[PDB]
Structures are given as structure tokens and as C-alpha cells.
């Protein structure tokens, strides 16, 4: 798995190219890959860390 | 180290002055 092949590159490009067309028709959900990376409680926890760094640096 | 070299240097200066005293012994051994 350390190396890549022509089959691996072609499969990766075909998979990533069919995932992009299925968002126009909305026949795939992809809410998990969205919200596991947004994660708004993690976002406000990080903003609280930035606010605490503003408090500690002033 | 801004202390430490100065902690050496004056010491070395004293040795030079001390060697000057030995030079005075060379002015008295002849």
C-alpha cells in the first residue's frame, strides 16, 4: 500500500470524479463527511482557546 | 557568558600584571 499503480490512480480519479457529479443530482447524502470536519462544537471550543490566548496575552 | 568571559578576562589581566612583577625580578636578577 506504500506504492501506487495505474489501477490505483485511475480508480482514485474515477471515484473522486463520480463523487462530484452525484452532488448536483443529490442522490448521495455526504452529511457525515461534512459535519465530521466542520464540527461546530469543536469550532467554538477552538474559538474559546483563541479567546483564552487573547486573555493570557493581554 | 556575558559575565563569564569578563570573569576570565580581568583575571588574565592580573596575570599580565603579575608577570610584569616577574619582569621586575628580571630587572633585579642582573
Amino acid at each position: 500500500y506504500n506504492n501506487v499503480t495505474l489501477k490505483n490512480l485511475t480508480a482514485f480519479q474515477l471515484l473522486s470524479q463520480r463523487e462530484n457529479i452525484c452532488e448536483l443530482l443529490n442522490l448521495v447524502e455526504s452529511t457525515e463527511r461534512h459535519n465530521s470536519i466542520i464540527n461546530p462544537e469543536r469550532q467554538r471550543m477552538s474559538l474559546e482557546e483563541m479567546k483564552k490566548m487573547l486573555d493570557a496575552l493581554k | 557568558e556575558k559575565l563569564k568571559y569578563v570573569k576570565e578576562s580581568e583575571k588574565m589581566l592580573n596575570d599580565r600584571l603579575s608577570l610584569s612583577k616577574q619582569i621586575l625580578d628580571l630587572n633585579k636578577s642582573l
Binding site: 495505474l6 485511475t10 480519479q13 474515477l14 470524479q17 463520480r18 452532488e23 470536519i37 | -
Partner: protein, 244 residues
């Protein structure tokens, strides 16, 4: 370390995208400032890390402190240096600076020195020219050890790995943005591109299905597959090359 850098498996500081519109982000400049701040601070640290080093019997007792920090000098070399028992590198530097004071090289022309009285006395040689390599080789012979007592009668790697993984996720999100933006501007000649390239990549993935175990031990490749035409047409060529 080596003379060349070490290849390694995991990525190391992949790029930051530059094609995102700054009317919405207005933040990649600030992260850029943080990155060159880190590079400047690391430059300072690396420079300072480099520059920080820049019958009657006798009594014989081999002591605890047989130590080469102060090593005994031969008395000829002690007269040439002046110090009593200092060190070995101090001896080499003092001998070389004595040679450099007396202007003996040339006014191999810089290898050969002019042998003077004291230096021939401390080397027990009588040449006029002798190269400096052998002169400083003799220093290893002229020095003897000190006499004993004689009486007779990290987390930073994982953190940078996490930042690299996160920058790769940023690249993925930016490429997925740019696809839909370029489809939004002119949609015709990207959907034709999709219908071409998806078909071509399907043909490329279906270029390998007749090379299995039990798809070649059987007979449904050679017989009756003139629909395929790919192999069993090379046999007019391969016999003519002698391979068989």
C-alpha cells in the same frame, strides 16, 4: 547525519492554495505571515544552535584520576611551549602558532617549513625541509601520560504531521470548490469532459479482466473470441520472433 537528506514515507509540508477568492476568505495572508514568522524564528534558532559550539619493595598505585585533561609534556616540548603540563590541543595550537610566528613556510612550498634549532631539538631530526604533516604527527609521539604515585624504599513531529494532514484536507476542499466553480461558469465543456473522461477511465479499469486464474485455465479466451481480437492475433508475430 548523512551527506544527502533521508527519504521518508509521510508527507512534509504540502502547499497552501492560492486560487481561493480573498473577498471571502481574507485569512490565508495571515496564516502566510504566521508561516514566515515560524521560518524566521527557526532560522534564528538553527543559527544559534550551530554557533553555541563556535629486600625492599616499591609502592605503585594507579589512581582514580588517571585523566587526559592535563597530560605530561616532554621537557624539550615543554621548553618550546613554555607551559608545564597543559593539554594536547593546546600543544598543537601552540606549536602551530610558533611556526606561524617564525615565518617558516615560504615568503609543496607551504607544506615544507624551515627547520630551526629548537624545533630540530624537539623533533631529533636534522633536515632543512620537512612537511607539516609529519611535524604534527610527531606531536603524538612527543606527549606522554601523567605519572602515577611512585614511592620507592517528540511531540513536535506529531504536531507537524497533524498540520500537514490538515493542509492536505484544505487542498481537498479547495479542489472540490474549484470544480463546481468552473462548472458554474461554463458548464458545457466540463460536462462533455466528464462524459469523455469517465468513459475512458472505465475502459482503462476494464482493460484488465481476462488475466485471472480460472479465466485463463478455461477456454473462453482463445476459441470464439474474435469479438475481442486482442490476443490470438499476435501468434503470426510471436512465432516469427522465435519466442514461441
Amino acid at each position: 547525519t548523512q551527506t544527502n537528506p533521508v527519504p521518508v514515507t509521510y508527507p512534509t509540508d504540502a502547499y497552501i492554495p492560492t486560487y481561493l477568492p480573498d473577498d471571502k476568505v481574507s485569512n490565508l495572508a495571515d496564516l502566510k505571515k504566521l508561516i514566515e514568522m515560524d521560518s524566521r524564528l527557526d532560522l534564528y534558532l538553527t543559527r544559534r544552535r550551530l554557533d553555541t559550539s563556535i629486600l625492599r619493595c616499591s609502592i605503585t598505585i594507579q589512581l582514580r584520576g588517571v585523566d587526559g585533561g592535563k597530560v605530561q609534556y616532554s621537557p624539550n616540548l615543554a621548553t618550546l611551549i613554555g607551559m608545564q603540563t597543559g593539554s594536547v590541543n593546546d600543544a598543537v595550537y601552540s606549536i602551530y602558532k610558533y611556526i606561524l610566528i617564525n615565518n617558516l613556510f615560504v615568503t609543496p612550498e607551504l607544506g615544507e617549513v624551515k627547520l630551526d634549532s629548537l624545533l630540530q631539538k624537539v623533533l631529533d631530526t636534522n633536515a632543512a625541509h620537512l612537511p607539516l604533516m609529519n611535524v604534527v604527527q610527531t606531536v603524538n609521539k612527543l606527549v606522554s601520560p601523567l605519572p602515577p604515585i611512585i614511592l620507592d624504599y517528540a511531540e513536535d513531529t506529531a504536531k507537524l504531521r497533524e498540520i500537514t494532514k490538515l493542509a492536505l484536507q484544505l487542498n481537498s476542499s479547495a479542489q472540490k470548490y474549484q470544480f463546481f466553480h468552473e462548472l458554474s461558469l461554463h458548464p458545457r465543456e466540463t460536462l462533455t469532459h466528464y462524459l469523455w473522461s469517465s468513459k475512458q477511465n472505465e475502459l482503462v479499469l476494464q482493460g484488465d479482466q481476462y488475466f485471472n486464474e480460472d479465466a485463463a485455465r478455461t477456454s473462453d479466451i482463445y476459441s470464439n473470441n474474435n469479438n475481442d481480437r486482442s490476443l490470438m492475433g499476435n501468434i503470426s508475430l510471436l512465432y516469427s520472433q522465435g519466442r514461441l
